[PDB]
Amino acid sequence: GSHSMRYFYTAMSRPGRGEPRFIAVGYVDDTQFVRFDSDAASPRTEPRAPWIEQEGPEYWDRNTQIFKTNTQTYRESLRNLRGYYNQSEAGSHIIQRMYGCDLGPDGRLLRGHDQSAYDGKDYIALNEDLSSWTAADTAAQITQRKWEAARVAEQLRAYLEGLCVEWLRRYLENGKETLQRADPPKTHVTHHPVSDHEATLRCWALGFYPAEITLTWQRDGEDQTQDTELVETRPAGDRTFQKWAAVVVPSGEEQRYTCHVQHEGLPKPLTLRWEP
């Protein structure tokens, strides 16, 4: 199938409470495989999936060097952005960065990403051309000028088209039994009366991987988008995910409703109804 690698960096200032915290986590699809936390007693890159443990000491040392450097650099960057927005030294602020590469089902580069945010708003992003930037405001335009002078885009393009894909393909091979295994959802429909003449049909999907899934209700074959309560897909804690979709139906009309489930793990898409 299609696969991606992402690193998620969070750098958070906390005036009066020491220097900014830097966190980095790395993912392949919905599977985290490393972390680094500058607040840890002894900050180092740590494995978070069994298949990465086989990487050698030089891998771990190199990762930790990079993340320690990031920790220092992001502290300067946070200072910089405070200034760009004429902000007081009193407030806490956050820079987030997420970057990485996407492969298609044939394993070749689909596209690269490098995106940053400040206090939860888009700040600056590498365009899909991996050559130019989109800056959100006049502050981000200052970052853009700096990054053009440092040839940052060119350096990211090299990483995204080169090492990013190489490593992702390596991880996909080393973790093939899990990373390249789609687990289909176990599904059922439950029925809960909500009154004398309405009941809740809840369509459940459990134990699936990856997290991407589509869960819909139809009445007489017609989508019930507005009437369906859809919870956010949630992690079970064993790598798998869970989701449900609920609809409130007139009592007696239950058989007019069908739950439809699409997932990569499914040999065939599912159509489910309540089975009294």
Partner: peptide
């Protein structure tokens, strides 16, 4: 594996 030098550039 994370990118290195490119990220060492302050915002």
């Amino acid at each position: 594996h994370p990118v290195g030098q490119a990220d060492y550039f302050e915002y």
